Ligand binder design. Structure first.
Ligand SMILES: *[C@@H]1O[C@H](COC2O[C@@H](C)[C@@H](O)[C@@H](O)[C@@H]2O)[C@@H](O[C@@H]2O[C@H](CO)[C@@H](O[C@@H]3O[C@H](CO)[C@@H](O)[C@H](O)[C@@H]3O)[C@H](O)[C@H]2NC(C)=O)[C@H](O)[C@H]1NC(C)=O
Ligand SMILES: [Ca+2]
Ligand SMILES: [Ca+2]
Ligand SMILES: [Ca+2]
Ligand SMILES: [Cl-]
Length: 276
C-alpha cells in the first residue's frame, strides 16, 4: 500500500484559449480574449506503461483532480523538503493531488495531466479542454520530489511527483509488511527492506529469545527479561553459582544443593543444637 503524489506549481496560458482555438469564457470564436479568464483546474490520470503513449483512458492505477487554482496563468508553491515540513504544520494545499493504491507498485507508469475550464456545471464537455500532456516513465518510492516540464500546444506546465509507501510497508513495491512489536510474538523493529531487527538484548528468529546477564550460569538459571539471571530451585547468587543449603540449615554449609554439613560442636539435622 502506498500513495502517488503530484504537485502543480506553474501554468502559463498567455492567450487564454482552449485547445480548440476559442476563448475560455466568451463567444466561441476560433485584441486578446477579454477579462473573463479561464477558470483553470487539473485532472490527473495514472495508468500502465505504454511504449507509445495514447491520450486515452481508463486510468488503471487511479485518478484525482483539483478545484479552480487560478486564471489564465498563475504560480503556486513548489514541492520539496522545505515544503514538506511547511505542510506538516498545517486546510490543505489545493494544487496537491494524492492517489492512494493497494496493489504492488509496478515502478513503471504513464501519467496524463489535463487542464480544464470550469463553468459551474458537472456535465462532461470535451470542448472545455485547455491542454493535455503525458509522460511515460519510471519511479521508485522515496520522499524526494522529481520535477517534470511540459510545453504543449497551448499551455506550459511545471509539476513535481513522488511515490511513498504507507506506514509499516517497505520494499520498492510498497507490498512488504513489517510492524514493530514487543509482546509474546516477538521484540523487533523494521529496517528499510521490511526485515525484522531485534531490539537490544534479544535474539532468535522472531526475536523471542532473550540474552541473560553476562556471567549467568545457564546450567542453574535463565532469564525471561534481558540482562537478568534467575536461578533454578536449589541455587542462588548474582550468577546463580552458589548452592542453597537444606531448608532450615543454621550452622551448616553446602557445596551441592540441599546439603547441611554442621560446623564443629553443632548437631542436629539443621545444625542448630549447641553441643557445649
Ligand atoms: C463556481 O465554481 C467555482 C469553482 O470552485 C470549485 O471548483 C470546482 C471545479 C469544484 O471542485 C468545486 O467543488 C469548487 O468549490 C466556485 O468558486 C469557489 O468556491 C469555493 C466554495 O464556494 C471556494 O472554496 C473555499 O474557500 C474559502 C476561503 O476563501 C474557505 O473558507 C471555504 O471553506 C472553501 O474552502 C473557492 O475558493 C472558490 N474559488 C474561486 C476561484 O472563486 C464558485 O463558488 C462557483 N459559483 C457558483 C455560483 O456556484
Ligand atoms: Ca467556459
Ligand atoms: Ca472565467
Ligand atoms: Ca469558465
Ligand atoms: Cl510564451
Amino acid at each position: 500500500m502506498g500513495y502517488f503524489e503530484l504537485q502543480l506549481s506553474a501554468l502559463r496560458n498567455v492567450n487564454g484559449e482552449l485547445l480548440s482555438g476559442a476563448c475560455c469564457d466568451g463567444d466561441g470564436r476560433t485584441g486578446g480574449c477579454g477579462h473573463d479568464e479561464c477558470d483553470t483546474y487539473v485532472r490527473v490520470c495514472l495508468k500502465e506503461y505504454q511504449a507509445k503513449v495514447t491520450p486515452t483512458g481508463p486510468c488503471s492505477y487511479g485518478h484525482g483532480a483539483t478545484p479552480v487554482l487560478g486564471g489564465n496563468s498563475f504560480y503556486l508553491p513548489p514541492a520539496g523538503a522545505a515544503g514538506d515540513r511547511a505542510r506538516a504544520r498545517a486546510d490543505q494545499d489545493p494544487g496537491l493531488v494524492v492517489i492512494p493504491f493497494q496493489f504492488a507498485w509496478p515502478r513503471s507508469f504513464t501519467l496524463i495531466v489535463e487542464a480544464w475550464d470550469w463553468d459551474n456545471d458537472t456535465t462532461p464537455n470535451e470542448e472545455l479542454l485547455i491542454e493535455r500532456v503525458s509522460h511515460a516513465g519510471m519511479i521508485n518510492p522515496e520522499d524526494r520530489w522529481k520535477s517534470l516540464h511540459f510545453s504543449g500546444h497551448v499551455a506550459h506546465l511545471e509539476l513535481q511527483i513522488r511515490v511513498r509507501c504507507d506506514e509499516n510497508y517497505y520494499s520498492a513495491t510498497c507490498n512488504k509488511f513489517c510492524r514493530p512489536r514487543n509482546d509474546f510474538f516477538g521484540h523487533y523493529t523494521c529496517d528499510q527492506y521490511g526485515n525484522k531487527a531485534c531490539m537490544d538484548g534479544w535474539m532468535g528468529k522472531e526475536c523471542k529469545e532473550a540474552v541473560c546477564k553476562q556471567g549467568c550460569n545457564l546450567l542453574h538459571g535463565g532469564c525471561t527479561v534481558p540482562g537478568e539471571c534467575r536461578c533454578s530451585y536449589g541455587w542462588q547468587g548474582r550468577f546463580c553459582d552458589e548452592c542453597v543449603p537444606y531448608p532450615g540449615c543454621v550452622h551448616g554449609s553446602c557445596v551441592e544443593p540441599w546439603q547441611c554439613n554442621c560446623e564443629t560442636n553443632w548437631g542436629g539435622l539443621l545444625c542448630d543444637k549447641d553441643l557445649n
